[PDB]
Every structure is written in C-alpha cells, then in structure tokens.
Amino acid sequence: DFCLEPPYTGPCFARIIRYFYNAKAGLCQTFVYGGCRAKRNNFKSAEDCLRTCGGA
Amino acid sequence: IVGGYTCGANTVPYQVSLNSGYHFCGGSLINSQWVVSAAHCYKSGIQVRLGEDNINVVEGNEQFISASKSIVHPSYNSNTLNNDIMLIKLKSAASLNSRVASISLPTSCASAGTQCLISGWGNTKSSGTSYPDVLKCLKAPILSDSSCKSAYPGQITSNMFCAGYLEGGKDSCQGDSGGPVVCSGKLQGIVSWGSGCAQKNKPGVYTKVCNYVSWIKQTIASN
Ligand SMILES: [Ca+2]
C-alpha cells in the first residue's frame, strides 16, 4: 500500500509543496517535493490525496 | 544554500525567483525576455520575480512578470535527469538596469578547479529546515568528471558536472534548483540534483550549460 509510505522528497532541489497521506494522523499533509522521482504518495491537492488514499 | 553567505541586495542581478504562490525554484535571466532554469522546475502558472533580495517583502526593486511560454529540453529524461534544462519566455520584457541584468552564456566549458558563484533562496540547513528571506551565495569549485562519477556511480552523464566540497558543509539544497552557477562572468551550470544537502563525499550535480548554447540561442530566436 503506497498510501502508507512515508513522503519522498527525492534528489532534486526544488521546493514544491505537495500532499501525502499520513496514515498515523488519518489525513493528508503537506511536504516538500524536490521536483523529480516522485513516489505514489505525492499529490497536487488535498482532494486528490483524500480520494486516492482517504481511510487507508 | 548550506554554508554560504548573504550576497547583499541585488549583487546577483541575473538571479530570478520562480513563484507559484510561493518560491519553488530559481532561474537566470539571459536576456530581457528569457530565463533559463531546470526542466524539473516546470510548472503551470509561473510568475517570474526579478530584482528580488528579501523574497518575503516588497522592497521596491522588483518586477513580477508572468511566463508566456515554458520550453523544456526535448530530450529531458525525468528518470536519469539528463538534459535538465528549460527556457521560460516572459510575457513582457523586463526593464534592465543595475539591479536587474542578464548573465552571459559561455563561449566554452569550464575546467575542474574553476571557482564559481552559486546563489539561491533554498534551505540553509543540512540537517533540518531554515529557508532564508534574503539571497544566499556560495563560492565552490568545479570538480573533475572522475571524482563526480566516483561520487555517483552510473548516474553522471556528459551533460552534468559536480561542484562543491567533498568534506561537505557547503552546497545547494531544496529551493535552489534552476539557479545559476556562474564562473568568470559566464553561466556554466544550473542547480539540479544531489544526495541530501552538504553531505560529505556527495557534492551537488549541475546541468552543464556549455553543451546547450547552440540549442538555447536558436530556441530563443524561433519563439
Ligand atoms: Ca522583495
């Protein structure tokens, strides 16, 4: 279950704010994505995040 | 920039901030209507901010101009990060002066040992998070292809170069991507990727601009 994976910033140096499902808190949270090599628990909005991972 | 120093207001006149509601990448002004940055910084709704020092307060020297076009290198590979370069056309031309000015493209590639100036508003902590208000600067030498390839086995292409210190402590970090690596007044690199920030034996990796000068000049002229 990719929804349970911790957020992955990646090797690139951008500071792009994305969302990831935090199963411990039971909600989608923001994190800094570096711009490349995104894993699946990485969403552009809280709505996309909840639709895909909500309640995982 | 980890381990750098405050540049001083508008002392790096070609440095730009890419903003999408907040600063997410840097870039370099190459002429009054074009900016060079990294391909991984591609995003819709980009506003380019020129003449910036403190990115959080309006100091009066700024020019905020929306991008009209964003051209990512046709061969950019999101997996290997090869050809990590992008050109952004400004909706209108910037007003150039001493606080806002373009940087020259290189006539030739720089050699190992050349000292360069790296700048940006990225994270200033290797372990932790601390984003600066003002522009930070770092002087770092270009490293040999041999050492770069030793630091990142099977990941360095002919379009990338390493710069920095093997001891760690001085490096680019999140928020610096797309920013300039200027050596002898010429734009030689674009902040691209690395392994964490300022870690020992892991210098930052930069896009080798000297390999794209022909593509840049022609692309800018036909758009
Ligand atoms: Ca400002």
Side-chain angles (χ1 to χ4, degrees), chain B residues 51-60 62 64:
Chain B
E52 288 283 21
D53 187 39
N54 182 325
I55 49 165
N56 294 311
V57 341
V58 175
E59 311 192 284
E62 303 92 335
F64 294 176

Side-chain angles (χ1 to χ4, degrees), chain B residues 128-138 140-144:
Chain B
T129 293
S130 183
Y131 292 97
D133 293 326
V134 301
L135 190 63
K136 298 305 184 167
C137 276
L138 174 73
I142 289 175
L143 304 185
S144 67

Side-chain angles (χ1 to χ4, degrees), chain A residues 1-23 25-38 40-43 45-56:
Chain A
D1 199 347
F2 69 86
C3 293
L4 311 175
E5 292 297 299
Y8 186 64
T9 294
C12 294
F13 294 133
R15 199 278 297 266
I16 294 164
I17 300 160
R18 292 283 177 91
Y19 291 79
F20 76 98
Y21 182 69
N22 183 343
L27 48 47
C28 291
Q29 297 229 242
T30 56
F31 80 101
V32 172
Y33 171 52
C36 70
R37 296 184 176 147
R40 288 177 296 171
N41 197 5
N42 178 329
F43 304 93
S45 72
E47 294 75 26
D48 287 343
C49 179
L50 284 170
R51 196 178 310 110
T52 303
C53 291

